[PDB]
Design a protein around this ligand. Sequence first.
Ligand code: PC7
Ligand code: PGT
Ligand code: HEM
Ligand code: HEM
Ligand code: HEM
Ligand code: HEM
Ligand code: UQ5
Ligand code: UQ5
Ligand code: FES
Lengths: 69, 57, 116, 109, 51, 387, 387, 51, 51, 28, 28, 34
Amino acid sequence: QPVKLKAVVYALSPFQQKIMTGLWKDLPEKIHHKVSENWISATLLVTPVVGTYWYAQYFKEQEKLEHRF
Amino acid sequence: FEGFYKLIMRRNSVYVTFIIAGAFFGERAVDYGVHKLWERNNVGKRYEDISVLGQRP
Amino acid sequence: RLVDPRKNFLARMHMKSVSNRLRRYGLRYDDLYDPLYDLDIKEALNRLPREIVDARNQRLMRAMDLSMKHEYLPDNLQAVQTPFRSYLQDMLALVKRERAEREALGALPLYQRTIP
Amino acid sequence: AFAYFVLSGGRFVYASVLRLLVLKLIVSMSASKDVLALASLEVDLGSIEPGTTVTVKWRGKPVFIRRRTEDDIKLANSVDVGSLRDPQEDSVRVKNPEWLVVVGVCTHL
Amino acid sequence: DRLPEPYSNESAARFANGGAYPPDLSLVTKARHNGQNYVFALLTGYRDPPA
Amino acid sequence: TIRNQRFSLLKQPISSTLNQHLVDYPTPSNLSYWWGFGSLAGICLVIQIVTGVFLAMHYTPHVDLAFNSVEHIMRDVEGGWLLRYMHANGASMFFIVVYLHIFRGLYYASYSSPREFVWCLGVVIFLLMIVTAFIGYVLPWGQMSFWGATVITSLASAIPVVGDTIVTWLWGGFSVDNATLNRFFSLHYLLPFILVGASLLHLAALHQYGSNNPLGVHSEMDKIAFYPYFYVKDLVGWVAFAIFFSIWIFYAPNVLGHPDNYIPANPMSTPPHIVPEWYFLPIYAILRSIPDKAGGVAAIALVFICLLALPFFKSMYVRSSSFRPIYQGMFWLLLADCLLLGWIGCQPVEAPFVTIGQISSLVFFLFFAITPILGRVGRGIPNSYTD
Amino acid sequence: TIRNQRFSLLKQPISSTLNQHLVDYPTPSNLSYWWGFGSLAGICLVIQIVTGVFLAMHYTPHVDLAFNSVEHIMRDVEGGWLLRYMHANGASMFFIVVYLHIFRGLYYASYSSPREFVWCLGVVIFLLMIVTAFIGYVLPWGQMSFWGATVITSLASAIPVVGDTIVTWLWGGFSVDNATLNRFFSLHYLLPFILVGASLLHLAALHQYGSNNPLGVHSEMDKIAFYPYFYVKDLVGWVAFAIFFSIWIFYAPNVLGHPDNYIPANPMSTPPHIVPEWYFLPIYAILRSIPDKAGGVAAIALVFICLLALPFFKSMYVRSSSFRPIYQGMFWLLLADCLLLGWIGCQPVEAPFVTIGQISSLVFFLFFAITPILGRVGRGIPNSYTD
Amino acid sequence: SWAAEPEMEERKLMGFKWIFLLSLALLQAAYYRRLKWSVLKSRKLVLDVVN
Amino acid sequence: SWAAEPEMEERKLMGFKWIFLLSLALLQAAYYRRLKWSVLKSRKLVLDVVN
Amino acid sequence: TIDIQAAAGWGIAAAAGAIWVVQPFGWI
Amino acid sequence: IDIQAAAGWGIAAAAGAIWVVQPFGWIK
Amino acid sequence: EVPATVEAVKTPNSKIVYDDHNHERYPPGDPSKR
Ligand SMILES: CCCCCCCCCCCCCCCCCC(=O)O[C@@H](COC(=O)CCCCCCCCCCCCCCC)COP(=O)(O)OCC[N+](C)(C)C
Ligand SMILES: CCCCCCCCCCCCCCCCCC(=O)O[C@@H](COC(=O)CCCCCCCCCCCCCCC)COP(=O)(O)OC[C@H](O)CO
Ligand code: HEM
Ligand code: HEM
Ligand code: HEM
Ligand code: HEM
Ligand SMILES: COC1=C(OC)C(=O)C(C/C=C(\C)CC/C=C(/C)CC/C=C(\C)CC/C=C(\C)CCC=C(C)C)=C(C)C1=O
Ligand SMILES: COC1=C(OC)C(=O)C(C/C=C(\C)CC/C=C(\C)CC/C=C(\C)CC/C=C(/C)CCC=C(C)C)=C(C)C1=O
Ligand code: FES
């Protein structure tokens, strides 16, 4: 079903704008935003993997040492 | 770039021919440059650099 | 109640997080309710006044534009947002009660979802 | 009611034809006559050191041989049968006190 | 022609090498983990056993 | 308007279906690069089919010739090395892309109503992909091929009464032999075409309602045509994927594989380490975490049962993880758990990895057990968080 | 109507397209049993695909094993002789049902406007059928397989500049050998799915306008639903086809072929009577008649050019042979001429058969040369035959 | 003859049974088509046109 | 090592060439996408709604 | 008189593409 | 109409299983 | 009060400001970059 909208949109032609410089514009703010918003998500992804890997290597090392005469 | 535009981009047939020519010549140039880098990086290791080549008794 | 932010600080943090996320886009929590998810939502949306639904659609368009542009609402527009000002839940509850009444008396449903 | 009877008639045949074609396709994947031909034979063996094993060959299946030592038999005759998930004593499995011969394929997969 | 085979079949190879089969070396560096290093280390790594 | 004359050729009956399904199809303007992966998977399927058709021109499905025919493809046919490395690593690219796709769907709750049928068709497609890739991996007839075929055909023996007869029917004999390889070849040519048909049905089901978006909201107010905007976005994705695939093909063609499959199949000796391809490892881990044949097979089936039952859970009316902090966190835990299951599948079956595998399998099933509880509880959020 | 509730399940989105294209599609009520051969063609395609998939599980595409693997199917596979005979005779059945289909189209002028695209798709489908069946006949690797492969792959040598290059590329070498067989087998698995797609496009193009009828008139005023009327009408033809096919399979399995393909391929000797299957005989007679290699290839291509150009010739507005007696006679002459060409193709190249074949090919081409002039002349019939 | 065609007897035994059964099925199918089409074939159509 | 991978040198030359070319293509693709999307991303949208 | 120029341009394009796919420098 | 139908369709399924697979000898 | 869309429709603006987070415009009247 079509939606009934009321809006005014103004647009500039693609050939009247700079195309690429906006990628490296306010880069530190972009990094700020990605880190600040995503640090819990990143912790929940990485910590179980690294913790489990480290514990497995620790277990393997101690087990190898225990069987050594 | 407007002068080059008036010779290459006014007709799509010329533009398409220009694209075909660019593919041909650019791929040849890149091939040549990559082979130059390969030769410069492997001096002395080629089959043609075997000291005794042709000298198996 | 564990869901009440007035009692559980975890619920309070949950509410604050959701409110900040909605405020960034100018969206209301009721705007997240989609007429394609449930037929009861579609019915409730159809019962609402044109002005409420128009404001919802405008907020959705503004949010989609911001999402496309990778930008949030300017902080001055963020200060005047009302993320949990409700317009839909009461109508939706009334619709669900009416459907339950129809089912309890053995009547045919007033609307059905198509089989995809 | 006359028309149901005439129709049931040919529906018998349609069902039979479906079953025949499907079963022919399914059974074509079963073992071929030549595969079943090579399914029976026996071989002989020699001897080995007391404490090592050597695998030998059959249809597509290894066979394990392990002549066990005295302490090996002591170890193999000290396990509770009840605790075993497949209760069986070593004496039943072996026809010789020390020569242990067994098909060497895992019963799991 | 392919390179010649030292033995007529695998059973002959095992009989000539005390029951062990010297594997074909055409893909041996791809058929072992860390293949090139492994082959070099094995060839130059014959020494006395641990106590 | 009355269509007396011909307008755009795109709107003529010759072209109209393609136009309306491919050029003018309305698409939400805020789709991210995470919506590029369906088209990537489509391109991977076409790449696999093209390379496999050309490779089947030189491959001999016989136990006495299969390994040698692969080697002949690598050494003798011109560009053969490229065709083989492209098919073998394109299977891996296909699975990487499809995994990224499935996890976009899980993060945005794209499985929810009205897109349940899309998700179910995707699950069927995933099953088809798994079977296709496995039987394809049998074809070189290396050690890995033979022993993996042995165990997967043996899986049917978990059935008590008729399990053995199914195993021997799958083999075509009392062991994995030439009959197994020949039937696996036919199946390998066939299943890709069924995959194409299933993918087309997947796409049609998705266009019934249109794509979901990163906000998870109704999107009818801000839709734009597929061509050219999402065409050029997917093109950026296609070129980046080409660079990735080329790195794998030309510089690390064997890193995503095991050297054991360069040894011809020996039915006498099982290699000391016997693992499937990397993209099957999580299922391997879930299988081995159960100390029981039937239990393991049942857990493997329960994985797909949970995947199929996911869209039909009574849930809250909020889709995107962008507005669901608890579900979002559970998403990033599930992603870590799946990566752990994959790593565990590569390990020998011994301590401490049995316990870790068991706990990881439990966590994986807890995701699907907990999501419905989350939906039921979160139904009460709008009544408890008042303005 | 406002579709608030669900009515009949067939009208739901899950089955609306199958209801509209297959169940409720309007069909002229006066269609004869001549209109039941498209469905028969489709069932033949399905039979070929299923039997071939199950045959490929036992066939080896190698010159040292192909013949012996075909004999191993006949002898060792349980149900194998039935898989082979169904596939081999199925191929002949496909060609019979497709020839009757084509001649039905020619008698009713089914190729005429608005259904030109239907006819062109049909011609493409016929080409695909010929390539598929030919390469399939090479797989057994008997005498006929090998020498038939040696000729058709040499047809490219008619090209002056690149002809020999094309011949040696198609061969994969300097002779018909293992490379040719392997690439034929790969092409022969792939081509039938392209045939399935082409058939689907064929049916869609036809359903844009609906079927022509034996009166050749506009039929909107007397259309009925395909199911169940034309379903049961087609079922009668399906059962009759089953009886015919069963007679061929069980009582005359090898009378449609030649005994020479039961001899293993010998590149040294050559059979004194090198013939193709009967369904390629008319084409092969038209080829042998021209006394120049190039002229023969040209004539073969001109056959398909004439078939493709038939719908586009300016014609009269009457369709059915029912009301075009002269075109009707031209039809009965063309059909006799095609049966003559097929018989001549089986005859050795020696008098009087050379001249008979030349005259027959001439008449075949005269049919297409004369149809347009008949259309132009008959456009004046309504003015001339007044009240 | 037996060596070339070892499947002849089973094949013949199948052709007799299946042609008898398929002929019965053809009779049924004819009856089914005619029963379904009778409502259309016996219908009386009344129109105003004459020529 | 040469015996196991005799195509290695051709493979590496191809890899260098085509990865360089594909990187150029990726830069062009990014420019193309952003050129086509700039009219949307820079658009100014005015709507009635506030909260 | 532009269709002829279009035909000539596209013919040049087709020739350029032919020499580019097949690259017959060792045959000319 | 719900329990009787379920019983009837279960009986039909069991009969069809006995007809497709014919294990006359598994009655042990 | 008058809503913003009505005011925009009623008052043409020759001093249009486009969104600049992703793209910065060339000065108005610049030659096209085609
Ligand atoms: C014989 C004639 C030449 C034949 C080759 C024709 C094609 C040449 C390829 C293009 C080369 C020029 C590339 C752009 C140069 C400009 C670099 C630049 O400044 O970046 C551009 C954007 O350009 C790009 O993004 C780079 C795209 C390059 C595409 C890759 C070229 C491929 C080379 C092909 C060579 C053939 C070898 C390959 C053969 C197979 C900035 O755009 P804006 O942000 O809109 O403006 C910024 C404002 N200001 C101007 C002040 C800086
Ligand atoms: C694979 C399955 C894993 C099984 C896990 C075992 C069982 C655990 C299940 C629970 C999932 C674990 C992860 C849950 C925590 C996720 C992290 C989180 O939500 O913290 C938020 C903090 O707010 C909260 O949500 C805390 C709430 C605590 C829980 C209170 C429960 C009451 C609410 C019940 C509602 C139920 C439905 C909710 C739907 C979302 C994030 O805040 P923010 O991102 O908005 O910004 C802050 C940051 O600095 C910048 O990014
Ligand atoms: C109809 C299309 C296909 C054909 C004709 C085909 C054909 C082949 C052939 C002949 C081989 C053996 C040669 C070799 O090992 O390189 C093979 C291997 C393989 N195929 Fe396919 N294939 C097709 C599609 C697919 C698809 C869609 C996948 C992934 C889902 C796939 C995955 C594989 C895998 C993993 C191997 C083993 C590769 C290796 O280690 O060498 N194929 N295929
Ligand atoms: C060969 C494999 C597959 C192909 C070719 C394919 C293709 C596609 C395409 C083109 C889209 C639309 C564009 C996009 O969202 O990326 C899509 C969407 C989707 N796919 Fe698939 N897919 C495949 C596998 C799967 C699998 C395995 C699943 C889940 C188990 C799945 C579930 C979905 C869902 C839920 C969507 C909707 C996404 C949304 O609206 O946000 N697909 N698929
Ligand atoms: C794979 C082979 C083919 C299949 C499965 C097939 C299938 C069909 C089907 C189902 C129909 C509609 C029903 C009917 O009238 O029969 C049809 C119509 C038609 N087919 Fe085919 N066909 C095939 C090959 C051909 C060929 C080779 C031609 C001619 C060159 C052709 C020309 C036509 C025409 C003209 C019609 C329209 C007939 C009419 O309305 O009177 N077909 N086809
Ligand atoms: C995907 C589908 C198909 C597959 C997998 C397939 C496979 C095979 C195989 C393995 C053979 C060799 C064994 C034998 O000769 O009996 C064969 C032979 C043959 N196929 Fe097919 N086929 C398919 C479809 C078709 C179709 C559609 C046609 C008809 C156009 C056809 C015509 C033939 C012919 C004429 C032979 C030679 C039969 C003989 O004399 O022995 N096939 N096919
Ligand atoms: C060490 O062990 C193991 C391996 O080894 C190295 C493996 O690789 C894998 C990898 C396997 C996985 C993940 C699952 C494979 C799943 C399926 C369903 C494949 C089974 C299908 C087969 C064999 C072919 C299907 C056959 C058909 C359809 C017959 C055709 C019949 C007709 C048309 C009538 C696992 C788990 C494993 O633990
Ligand atoms: C708005 O819609 C669109 C999308 O957004 C939802 C898309 O995601 C895609 C991309 C989707 C596709 C096609 C990927 C799906 C995967 C498939 C089907 C892989 C199999 C590919 C083949 C062979 C194509 C099948 C189709 C036909 C007709 C066969 C003939 C064609 C060929 C031989 C190539 C496109 C193009 C699109 O516009
Ligand atoms: S096959 Fe031995 S434990 Fe699995």
